Ligand binder design. Structure first.
Ligand SMILES: Cc1cc2nc3c(=O)[nH]c(=O)nc-3n(C[C@H](O)[C@H](O)[C@H](O)COP(=O)(O)OP(=O)(O)OC[C@H]3O[C@@H](n4cnc5c(N)ncnc54)[C@H](O)[C@@H]3O)c2cc1C
Ligand SMILES: Cc1cc2nc3c(=O)[nH]c(=O)nc-3n(C[C@H](O)[C@H](O)[C@H](O)COP(=O)(O)OP(=O)(O)OC[C@H]3O[C@@H](n4cnc5c(N)ncnc54)[C@H](O)[C@@H]3O)c2cc1C
Ligand SMILES: Cc1cc2nc3c(=O)[nH]c(=O)nc-3n(C[C@H](O)[C@H](O)[C@H](O)COP(=O)(O)OP(=O)(O)OC[C@H]3O[C@@H](n4cnc5c(N)ncnc54)[C@H](O)[C@@H]3O)c2cc1C
Ligand SMILES: Cc1cc2nc3c(=O)[nH]c(=O)nc-3n(C[C@H](O)[C@H](O)[C@H](O)COP(=O)(O)OP(=O)(O)OC[C@H]3O[C@@H](n4cnc5c(N)ncnc54)[C@H](O)[C@@H]3O)c2cc1C
Ligand SMILES: CCCCCCCCCCCCO[C@@H]1O[C@H](CO)[C@@H](O[C@H]2O[C@H](CO)[C@@H](O)[C@H](O)[C@H]2O)[C@H](O)[C@H]1O
Ligand SMILES: CCCCCCCCCCCCO[C@@H]1O[C@H](CO)[C@@H](O[C@H]2O[C@H](CO)[C@@H](O)[C@H](O)[C@H]2O)[C@H](O)[C@H]1O
Ligand SMILES: CCCCCCCCCCCCO[C@@H]1O[C@H](CO)[C@@H](O[C@H]2O[C@H](CO)[C@@H](O)[C@H](O)[C@H]2O)[C@H](O)[C@H]1O
Ligand SMILES: CCCCCCCCCCCCO[C@@H]1O[C@H](CO)[C@@H](O[C@H]2O[C@H](CO)[C@@H](O)[C@H](O)[C@H]2O)[C@H](O)[C@H]1O
Lengths: 412, 409, 412, 404
């Protein structure tokens, strides 16, 4: 049936399958997606921001992939004529304690060759953002916005135009060895009789990458810990208050960039996302929990270790979500004239945050295969984590994943 | 934009929208479905059985709808060349107390003109199911199996071929009196600028029929109480032990038919469905809990009343679900050589069980309308069971209702 | 100091054993440690008040003789101390022919156990004993009576104190240590400086017998699983409808006798007790949950095995407890003119039900000691379980325990 | 079994009030009912054991006067009855310049309350009183002391019995009925009744529940706040000599986790203020579903939570993870580690809350059966001001019931 099957129709799975068929036009490739459309999850519930590569440690692959992907993204958006807006970014420091870290971000930004990075303070802050306070600001004019869900759909259309097959409504449930065939791996869906046979498998399952890796025989670690990213909607009567992206100076101990003011493609102004621990892999709303997710995430050895040191930051995120009057006061340090009457609760996304046994939040590439003999081992590779930000670096991530499965499966 | 809009892409919403455009080929009709495809919920997570109409009280509309819908369905499957199998059904009794209840089902099935219902003695059971036990059984040779999701999609294509528009990914969130116009009702989705104008609306929202009715001004009752229906997967090494449908003798006090043996179009044998109270409206996943949906299901004044009488039967369902060994012990009364190692927990559906203030499990049509939006939005908050088998007959009923209600034609 | 022997537990078993030993050996210096500020605050003070005759128990067993002997010892002790009691009698009523088969099994065990004046009663003779009670056949035990077992326990204590024994109320035993020489065991209370030294220790800690046994190195099994026993009160206007004890025919697979009609000493008629799994060791109130004692009742290996067979029997007890109307319908099989409006919710007790690793509800004697040769392993004996019924069998249990520690500790 | 007045509650407030009223009116037949089998089983027997001096409280208010007078009456009572105490001075230590301004506020309020002999003490001077303690500035209250308040409560009850009062232990007041003595009080045991002309309630953690039994509004509700203590190892008890208190947030009635010696020489660290999920929830795992539902559904709860949830979560997190509590304590005693502390006992504060979310710290009296008065709250600190609180309650009883 297929030489290679990619499980996962997100932006990482779609860009991977697209990059693979472009390199190898004779390879019969399929994509299996449990939902009925691409980019239903992480790739369709994001900030829509095209990152430039400021915060990332210089000389590392993460810093390279973001700057790589950003230029590859803008070029791809021009090639396919996908709408986008280069709104620019302002990382605003509110006190002299945040300018010590802001200057560190300036050094990292320049070393990563972020285009046109410049530090700014005084009245120049109100030149870019007339309603924004702040001691000192970092200006990144090439940070833009886009619909990453629409981009993912274009990845799938490019994949199909090269002969690729996309199976929507295909919930991968089990892998089995084919009867003694040239396609030794059959993939089973949740619907009876729904199967697909293949030589090799790559999985890009986002919020369920650890669960997918277990069905091949991989260890439970790194576990995917869901972090809900909630957004607030600024009222249309005050959408003029922000023009581009206004980011805070975040704590560099964590990969999160903090709650930020970001315009959407349709003109809306979204405030977020935050980082509240979800009690469900797809916990898009508060109170939508899964008890197996609760009992297993709390008993995961890495969980207690991270909470032992960073319980305060997580509780502060949840408290500011429970009572948005605490959130708007944090937002008034940047835009003071926003009140509780100007914001409403908006939609949310869920980060697939990888975590090791020590409690560290994994931000590197993690590829994994089972420990069998063995047909389901050796032939099923699981991409359990890709470096952030996955949407901006998607085209650069795809080239790394294409190299990985080429060396792992002897293709080309 | 449209004259009538049907909210709900399930089998009941699709069949009604298809029936009304076939009766009135000049009506501009649309379908709004919050998901990305049709039959994503009840119509796509069912037992796949074409019921014959045995259990239902003679003379009632429910009894007529199931036998008529069953005949209309088989004609539609032949008409569209949709795959199906007439596997037949056995309703097996295991002791003599169950025999009395079985004899009542024979009288009802004969009064309902179920063709061709016959009672067989325990010796003749193995002529139909060689591995099944039992002292007596009711034999329904025309009970069948089908992919109701594929049938629901064919309803939509028929609807599309007649000129109807299907809006997928349209999560109806608000109804609005149109500002200006010949289309007084506006329907708002969850996305900005996602609207559709209409003259009349019919909702068939399944698990959210009560929440949809509330948006017009209808009372919170009857409430939709979700009942999870779990399925067990039998290994292929024992699939040969079940030829057709093997059903137990159920308690006539409830609308549930019990955990049964049923082949899929796959040929694989599924054991179910369950009848476990769900802690979430769309609680397909086992441990999924919604605190709002659970606290509202338990604070509903009808919940404590029905639980005060029948919580024992509900508790027996969950313990057999918690401990599969107890469910295996029950199924061995029919197929003895099946152990716990022969099964695996499979997917589940969620029944949209309507319930009034008195705790009754409503099992008939419930239409509702506000006290603009009150006269032009009709909500079908419940339809008679079984919805899939009777879908074509239910749609004829529903088309009759909105034809009189909205003066269509 | 201090003492030769210390009995931990001020219940009816610890008090009776301590009373029996000082009577056998008047020169022995014995003390009783009880954590509450009074005797018999738990099981011995929250019971049905019934003096059992010894009908249900297997002939030839030690449990069968202890209850028959204990009942004769109890009435003799009650007369001697002028403690008020009432020989109300007991009717074990069968309602169908299946319970009739189980009833004559009970009668034959009662005859073999030498239960005095046991007579099988039939049809209309039932109304001569209980005019308002129905049934198809009943077993009549005229010598089954009622008493305040809590008052009996305090009488054991005053007998103990009159013979020179010391009672330490408000002494919560926290740990045993070696006195590094005339009294090698030191017992520590909760408050610092609250210590007592002795040569040998017997524990009768009821709901915490397993927790006490772990403190000197014994295994966690058999673990005490708490079963709340709830009672309902009949309105005074209908007390006349119940003259004596009216019991149902129980399932012999379980130690529990069913919900029964029992008059109290003040003329009250109590309906109970049931057998509902407590979510807390001392869970006398519904809703009182202890996360530790709950999460360790489950996850205990014997629990899931026991539930995998009998979960339905426990849930029916719960369903009738939550919905009193379901309990009244079952009680109407015996007394029909009793409605839901005629009853009130009353107090509850909690059974200290021992459970082995296989999931069996242990109902016999269980002793335990440390696994070494040191002071703690050799000088501390734990009674992890006493046979049912503990209150009726107390005087007989005491002589067995007295015989046991006489051999184990070379006393006398 | 018949009495003129019955006091429900055998804590320090109920015992001191019953003692005060029989001393004023020796012919009044008075009884006290206590549901436990001993006095001072709860708040009065699970406290910091500190005799406060009256530093934090606003001058001119009833709180500031009752504590200063109460501690003077307490010291005189302890000397008269020969009850052991130690008189280990207090040190309220500020650790940053942002804390010295709040400490100066406590000094101005302390001198206005006439706390002897309050004196602001500078950084170099801190080691002269606590050699191991850090700080940039501190407030020295040498007359603050320690005592076993449970032993004091039992001495109140003995004075009450010596004057002819009857103490009914193991008497769980469950119901009030009309019966001379028109009020009949029922216990939980069969046939356990007393009759009386008037009733006074001092039910601590169940004061709001007792007020409901006679038909009073459910507000103010008692919200339980568990107060956990940590135990310093014996090897480092020499590192603190007396009370070492921090500079607390003046918006709340809590004084914060502090270093405090006990009568046996032990050093206890606490108490914190974590929301308990049970009225008598002395341990973290011990919760009550009913006494969790209603505390959340109480209209005042979410109002206070919407403003100060961060302070409650900070308390809980430091309780869940000891390392975070140690880092806070190291600002005062730097050379202690997790190996130097162990988890200790806990108390539960009967914190009264109004419908607006305010933590009530004043007197609250509630009449119904019009012969039943419920003291739903007494001002803090209840133990130190016990004898002063009793006189006020005695005045209220004499005017409400016309005794004398
Ligand atoms: C709140 C939020 C905001 C973000 N903002 C930005 C931003 O501004 N800029 C940026 O560059 N990045 C951003 N990101 C990151 C970006 O969204 C992700 O890195 C990226 O979407 C990851 O893509 P993915 O395909 O790996 O995950 P997904 O998009 O979630 O893809 C996983 C897919 O696998 C499918 N799947 C899972 N299990 C199975 C199975 N068993 N069978 C079949 N299919 C299965 C799922 O249905 C899903 O479609 C944001 C992320 C979040 C959470
Ligand atoms: C476990 C199970 C087994 C069954 N087995 C059988 C069987 O063997 N035989 C048989 O005949 N019947 C069977 N049934 C019954 C049958 O499946 C249902 O009666 C039938 O599918 C009901 O159709 P429906 O369209 O009303 O429900 P649904 O299919 O649930 O349709 C509701 C639709 O409304 C949509 N919707 C809801 N809210 C909104 C909104 N705000 N905006 C837009 N769209 C919205 C939902 O997305 C959904 O697609 C079974 C049912 C269950 C639960
Ligand atoms: C609901 C119910 C009804 C019953 N009805 C009857 C009946 O009708 N007839 C009959 O014959 N029997 C009856 N029984 C059985 C009888 O009540 C018990 O078998 C018996 O009372 C148990 O005696 P015990 O002293 O071992 O238990 P307990 O009375 O519980 O004594 C244990 C004591 O040890 C103390 N303790 C525990 N840990 C420590 C520690 N660390 N330090 C100090 N002290 C400690 C406890 O505080 C307690 O006082 C009934 C039991 C129950 C639960
Ligand atoms: C952790 C903590 C530390 C403290 N530290 C200090 C300190 O250092 N200095 C200081 O001055 N103060 C301190 N306090 C305050 C002091 O302990 C209390 O203010 C004081 O004990 C209140 O006394 P009370 O009698 O009102 O409460 P309680 O002592 O709780 O008395 C209430 C009594 O009523 C009884 N009761 C309740 N319901 C019924 C019923 N239905 N029938 C019969 N009886 C019933 C209870 O059994 C209980 O004995 C502290 C408090 C806490 C919680
Ligand atoms: C297991 C449970 C424990 C949870 C595990 C640890 C969770 C850690 C969460 C990391 C926090 C999310 O990221 C955090 O976002 C906040 C909120 O914007 C940022 O905070 C920043 O911006 C906000 C406004 O947005 C300002 O008011 C604030 O003064 C400033 O610090 C932090 O600089 C950043 O670190
Ligand atoms: C909301 C809380 C309270 C819940 C409310 C009550 C829920 C009602 C559920 C009714 C039970 C479901 O339907 C019930 O299915 C079971 C299981 O097949 C049938 O049971 C029958 O078949 C099974 C095999 O499956 C046999 O082992 C069993 O002996 C026989 O009685 C019952 O006859 C039928 O009544
Ligand atoms: C921990 C989870 C699993 C729980 C473990 C299993 C618990 C088992 C408890 C056994 C039940 C208690 O004991 C059980 O009481 C019931 C109810 O009175 C008795 O029932 C009997 O009397 C009652 C009236 O009281 C009648 O309505 C009934 O028809 C008759 O059978 C049973 O004969 C007896 O077996
Ligand atoms: C119901 C949910 C919401 C809960 C409601 C809000 C609860 C508020 C509780 C108030 C906090 C308890 O009291 C609080 O104790 C802490 C910890 O000692 C004190 O904190 C002080 O001392 C600690 C060490 O002890 C120092 O590390 C700290 O820098 C200093 O501020 C606060 O000054 C005081 O305000």
């Amino acid at each position: 049936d297929y030489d290679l099957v990619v499980v996962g129709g997100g932006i990482v799975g779609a860009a991977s399958a697209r990059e693979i068929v472009l390199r190898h036009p004779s390879l019969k490739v399929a994509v299996l997606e449990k939902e009925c459309k691409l980019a239903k999850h992480q790739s369709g519930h994001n900030s829509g921001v095209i990152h430039a590569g400021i915060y990332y440690k210089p000389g590392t692959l993460k810093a390279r992939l973001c700057v790589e992907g950003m230029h590859l993204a803008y070029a791809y958006l021009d090639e396919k004529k996908i709408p986008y807006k280069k709104t620019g970014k302002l990382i605003v420091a509110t006190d002299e304690k945040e300018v010590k870290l802001l200057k560190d971000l300036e050094k990292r930004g320049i070393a990563n060759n972020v285009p046109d990075l410049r530090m700014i303070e005084g009245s120049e802050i109100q030149e870019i953002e007339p309603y924004c306070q702040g001691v000192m600001a970092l200006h990144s004019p090439h940070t833009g916005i886009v619909d990453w869900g629409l981009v993912t759909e274009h990845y799938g259309q490019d994949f199909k135009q090269c002969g690729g097959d996309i199976y929507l409504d295909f919930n991968v449930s089990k892998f089995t060895e084919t009867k003694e065939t040239d396609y030794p791996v059959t993939i089973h869906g949740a619907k009876p009789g729904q199967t697909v046979r293949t030589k090799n498998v790559l999985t890009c399952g986002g919020l369920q990458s650890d669960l997918l890796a277990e069905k091949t025989g991989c260890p439970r670690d790194p576990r995917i810990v869901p972090f809900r990213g909630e957004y607030l909607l600024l009222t249309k009567e005050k959408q003029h208050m922000v023009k581009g992206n206004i980011y805070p100076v975040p704590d560099p101990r964590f990969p999160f960039l903090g709650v930020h003011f970001t315009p959407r493609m349709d003109g809306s102004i979204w405030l977020g996302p935050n980082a509240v621990l979800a009690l469900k892999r797809e916990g898009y709303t508060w109170g939508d929990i899964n008890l197996f997710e609760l009992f297993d995430a709390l008993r995961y050895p890495g969980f207690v270790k991270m909470a032992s040191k960073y319980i305060g930051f997580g509780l502060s995120e949840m408290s500011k979500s429970w009572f948005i009057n605490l959130q708007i006061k944090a937002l008034q340090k940047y835009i003071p004239d926003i009140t509780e009457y100007d914001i409403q609760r908006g939609p949310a996304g869920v980060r697939a945050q990888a975590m090791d046994l020590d409690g560290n939040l994994v931000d590197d590439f993690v590829f994994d295969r089972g420990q069998g003999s063995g047909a389901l081992a050796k032939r099923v590779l699981h991409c359990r984590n890709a470096p952030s930000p996955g949407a901006t670096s998607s085209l650069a991530i795809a080239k790394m994943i294409a190299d990985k499965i080429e060396n792992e499966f002897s293709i080309g």
